[PDB]
Design a protein around this nucleic acid. Structure first.
Lengths: 252, 155, 189, 56, 124
RNA sequence: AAGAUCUCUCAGGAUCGCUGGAGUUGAUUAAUAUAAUUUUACCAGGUAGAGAUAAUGAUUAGAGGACAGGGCCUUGACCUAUUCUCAAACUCCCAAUAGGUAAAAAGGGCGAAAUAACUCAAUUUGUAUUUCACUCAUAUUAAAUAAAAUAACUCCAAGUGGGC
RNA sequence: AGAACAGAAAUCUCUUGUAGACUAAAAGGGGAAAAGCUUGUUUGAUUUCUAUUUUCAGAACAAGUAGAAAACGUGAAAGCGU
RNA sequence: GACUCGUUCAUACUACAGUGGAUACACCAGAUCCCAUCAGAACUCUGAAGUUAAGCACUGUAAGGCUUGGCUAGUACUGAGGUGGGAGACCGCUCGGGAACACCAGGUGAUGAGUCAG
């Protein structure tokens, strides 16, 4: 039979618009939202990170019945203002992006001077919870870098070490947030071939950042950021049908 | 013969057409304070905290709250006597009631109206109207617009 | 063999159909259903008569079969097989059960409500009295009260004869086997 | 606005709601009369006991 | 234009339908033919295959060459030689079906079609 | 009263129910408690009904189409739009009746101040309690109506548990 | 709808696929980024104690529901697991 | 204009079309490392060479569906009354309450919080 029967439309129940679109999980969201119900006005602030192809977006979110309120929000293309012009999709960039969001949030609260957090790379603070945001929580994913930046900033988001590189290497994490592997790949590609090196990291070449310089630039920026955060109608359609019908009768 | 836990619940606990699928996320946010009134409406997208048949469609005061549980004082008719029963349910089935809200709204509206009236020393019947008989009135009907009727013949 | 049938004039007890729970029923007596010139176009005929229920009668499956055979034979003797179609417009579907504890299945039956057609004849205008007479012969084979009627419809349609002609005139009505499809002006051609 | 209601019917064989309404209405002994304030609520209660009372 | 029909997947099947060894030998033949490890069927292991992409796939297709009737409706095809072949074709944007955030249907006028696929095969 | 639960139990018994006496408490202030009642709010429903072209199961017919047997053709199957009649143990939809919760003073308001080992990031972020304030209808009574307190409640005990 | 052997079944591929599958077992409920299927890690199928629901005398057992005090299991984490 | 989080959970769907891409989304470029496999397809990571073709947005269709409203119909049904009618089956009256499918007409979204770009 024809599967796209009238009956098939008629029975159908759609899944929720955001799930249908594919942005949200819902199962994760419902679990994430709920606080223990005898607690009152504890709103369980989520640190939401979504990784768009261009750039990673970090927001502080609070669930309410007429929809989520965002308190602080940062996008990777702000790092340009802080001296990083390039690499805005990168892991390094994501660590920076997270950190920027946390500092701006604290500044808004006026608790920037209350907690200056972790200096460089190795009362109780305000608390938040990392969002998965539909990407797999596979080891070395970008969200964990963002989480680390937030944490190093000042926010307390409980975490394991498991999904940083290796099953633990803190030195590798330090290299990675600095960007040392990206530089290594640049050196490696240049050694391999000059055409491939220039064609690939073309924007980097234009801006004029040597591989060696990337860590310095990111470090300088990182230090700077911590210091200083039309429709028709029925009568009309009726007409349109009449006109179309007359023309169709003549035409063929 | 048998009378087990979900006995005779077929159509009652089943969802309406196009209303299958998990409890909406928003629904966990709703506020419950002690002594708030609360309906007990069964679901079946959740299995834990499902209440026995009788407390479907009943409504009572919240007396106790846990991590996801809510204690509800419900009246039950047992032969010659109502007695109070503490039904522990989970949040998915407990729904914030509206019956209370009518009275609460009335209090707010009354308070404002009373304050203004009393300030002017204008005596006032704040209590509910409770629809009286229809008062007398004078009505213009055009003598050309009136229609006259008869019962129809049979066919 | 069968019960004498004075038992079943009263149609109390719930319906109770041939079904997965019940199983095991003997066959319905009537498998014939419609008869006559069954393939005839809606254009050819235009007269229609009905034999219509009034009691709330049960109607035996065997009685129904007999009534149908009687009706048919009367038309065939009178106007022959070019000129009508006899459509039984009821069915048995309810099981009756008897003892030799709870009963065992034994027969099937039809349970019409008041004011429902039992037997319908589609035919040509010259032959409507003949068809009426056939239905009149049929009525003596049913329990309970029934009246014979004729209609102002084209027969096997919702439409009145005049309406049918009017629609046919302005091309809004398509003959589609048995009866007629009304054009409702929807989507592309 | 007002309605005088006269009861018409014995004590025996009375439905339980009807008996309750009668008690509130205040017509017990079988030819008892009382005035009742027409409203909505009173009229509905009166409707329940209707086959047992004349009024006007 | 951007609408270029290309190979999207190449799948190579060998089935003996029986127990090990002969199945293993087939897998070794497949492996030698192209490097990637085979994977196997069921239990009512029964059969073997491997998938290919890119330059490797093009080489296998090219050796394959040495008919109009038997293309799919959907715009894919295979042929027989012992060994079986199936060639899966698409324009780019095939990613829209599988990419995890947005998984969704490609447009009808962007699906391959039989006639275009045949025309490409003669052309190639 | 001939209900109910348990019973080597079905002619019994126990224990509840339903009854009398005794007593206290409370009312005795046209009242608040309260009511086999309605009202206004507010719910919860899936039975009568209704449906088959909404799903599942039945179930009678033809019409128009692009796969199987035989010689454009025949029997079809198979589709597509239709059609006749249907279901305690089918359900898109769905009454009436019946049922629940609501209708303020030991309370509620909007404030302050206290207290805690709880809460929260938060000695003030809440919670909850407590203490003070200010003040809510009441000369018909925060909707009617009420031989509405002849009420509550406790004790001791009866008969009854074949019914129609 | 396609692809040696290859047929109605064999595997492989693409398209269509709101459940027509599967969910230990009756039958009814419930379930599609799962409750299903596949994979990883595990043993909370733990100890102690309440408030209680069902039948009901508002006794018992039994089967649950909601917690608490422990100790843990898993997950990145919220969580979830008696 | 666009985005991120959402809300109502089909007026939001589906099917076939057209129209749109400053910045944005995206497709798209690549595989050294983290990572992931049968397969860089996915996933992950690293890019920014191309492109509106798709996704996506917007609009269209005597569209299907969904959704309001009429109309079906005071029909079906029903609470209470009746020393009513009917041999029976069942059916009226008095005080009340009152549907459904089909059909026909309209409609095809609305919106909270935060951000970027002229």
């Amino acid at each position: 039979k024809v599967v796209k029967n009238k009956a098939y439309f008629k029975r159908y129940q759609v899944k929720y618009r955001r799930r249908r679109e594919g942005k949200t999980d819902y199962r994760a969201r419902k679990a994430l939202i709920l606080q223990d119900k005898n607690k009152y006005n504890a709103q369980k602030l989520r640190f939401v990170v979504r990784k768009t192809n261009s750039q990673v977006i970090c927001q502080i979110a609070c669930a309410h019945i007429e929809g989520d309120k965002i308190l602080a929000e940062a996008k990777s293309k702000e790092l340009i203002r802080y001296g990083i012009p390039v690499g805005l999709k990168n892991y390094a960039a994501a660590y920076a992006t997270g950190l920027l969001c946390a500092r701006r949030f604290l500044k808004s609260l006026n608790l920037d001077t209350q907690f200056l957090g972790v200096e460089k790379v190795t009362r109780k603070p305000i608390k938040a919870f990392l969002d998965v945001g539909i990407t797999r929580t596979t080891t070395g994913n970008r969200v964990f870098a963002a989480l680390k930046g937030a944490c190093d900033g000042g926010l307390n988001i409980p975490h394991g070490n498991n999904r940083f590189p290796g099953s633990f290497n803190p030195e590798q994490l330090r290299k990675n947030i600095l960007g040392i592997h990206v530089a290594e790949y640049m050196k490696t590609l240049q050694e391999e071939d000059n055409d491939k090196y220039k064609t690939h990291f073309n924007d980097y070449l234009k801006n004029n950042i040597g591989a060696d310089d990337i860590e310095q630039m990111y470090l300088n920026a990182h230090e700077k950021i911590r210091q200083n955060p039309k429709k028709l109608n029925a009568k009309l359609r009726k007409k349109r049908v009449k006109e179309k019908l007359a023309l169709y009768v003549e035409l063929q | 013969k048998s009378r087990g836990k979900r006995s005779g619940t077929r159509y009652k606990f089943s969802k309406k057409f196009r209303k299958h699928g998990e409890c909406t996320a928003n629904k966990y946010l709703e506020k419950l304070n002690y002594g708030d009134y609360v309906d007990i409406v069964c679901d079946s997208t959740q299995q834990k905290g499902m209440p026995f048949n009788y407390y479907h469609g009943k409504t009572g005061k919240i007396f106790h709250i846990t991590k996801r549980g809510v204690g509800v004082l419900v009246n039950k008719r047992v032969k010659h006597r109502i007695e109070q029963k503490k039904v522990c349910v989970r949040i998915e089935h407990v729904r914030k009631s509206r019956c209370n809200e009518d009275f609460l709204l009335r209090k707010i509206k009354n308070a404002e109206l009373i304050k203004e009236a009393k300030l002017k020393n204008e005596h006032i019947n704040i209590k509910r109207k409770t629809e009286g008989p229809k008062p007398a009135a004078m009505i213009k009907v055009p003598p050309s617009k009136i229609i006259t009727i008869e019962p129809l013949p049979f066919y | 063999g069968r019960r004498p049938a004075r038992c079943y004039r009263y149609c109390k007890n719930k319906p109770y159909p041939k079904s997965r729970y019940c199983r095991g029923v003997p066959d319905p007596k009537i498998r014939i259903y419609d008869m006559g010139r069954k393939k005839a176009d809606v254009n050819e005929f235009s007269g229609v008569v009905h034999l219509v229920s009034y009691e709330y009668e049960q109607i035996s499956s065997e009685a129904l079969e007999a009534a149908r055979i009687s009706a048919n034979k009367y038309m065939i003797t009178n106007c022959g097989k070019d000129n009508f179609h006899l459509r039984v417009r009821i069915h048995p579907f309810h099981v009756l059960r008897i003892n030799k504890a709870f009963g065992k299945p034994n027969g099937v039956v039809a349970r019409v409500d008041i004011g429902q057609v039992l037997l319908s004849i589609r035919t040509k205008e010259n032959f409507v009295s003949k068809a009426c007479e056939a239905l009149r012969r049929a009525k003596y084979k049913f329990p309970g009260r029934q009246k014979v009627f004729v209609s102002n419809k084209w027969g096997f349609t919702p439409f009145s004869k005049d309406e049918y002609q009017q629609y046919k005139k302005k091309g809004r009505i398509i003959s589609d086997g048995v009866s007629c499809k009304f054009i409702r002006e929807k989507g592309p051609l | 606005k007002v309605v005088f209601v006269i009861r018409l019917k014995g004590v025996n064989k009375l439905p339980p709601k009807v008996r309750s309404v009668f008690r509130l209405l205040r017509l017990l002994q079988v030819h008892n009369g009382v005035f009742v304030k027409v409203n909505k609520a009173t009229k509905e209660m009166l409707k329940i006991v209707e086959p047992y009372v004349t009024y006007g | 234009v951007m609408r270029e029909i290309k190979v999207n997947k190449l799948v190579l099947n060998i089935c003996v339908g029986e127990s090990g060894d002969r199945l293993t030998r087939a897998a070794r033949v497949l492996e030698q033919l192209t490097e990637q490890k085979p994977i196997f069927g069921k239990c009512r292991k029964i059969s073997c295959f491997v998938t290919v992409r890119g330059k490797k796939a093009l080489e296998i297709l090219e050796k394959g060459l040495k008919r109009r009737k038997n293309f799919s409706d959907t715009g894919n095809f295979g042929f027989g030689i012992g060994m079986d072949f199936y060639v899966h074709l698409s324009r780019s944007g095939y990613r829209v079906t599988r990419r995890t955030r947005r998984r969704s249907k490609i447009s009808k006028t962007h699906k391959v079609t039989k006639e275009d696929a045949m025309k490409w095969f003669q052309t190639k």
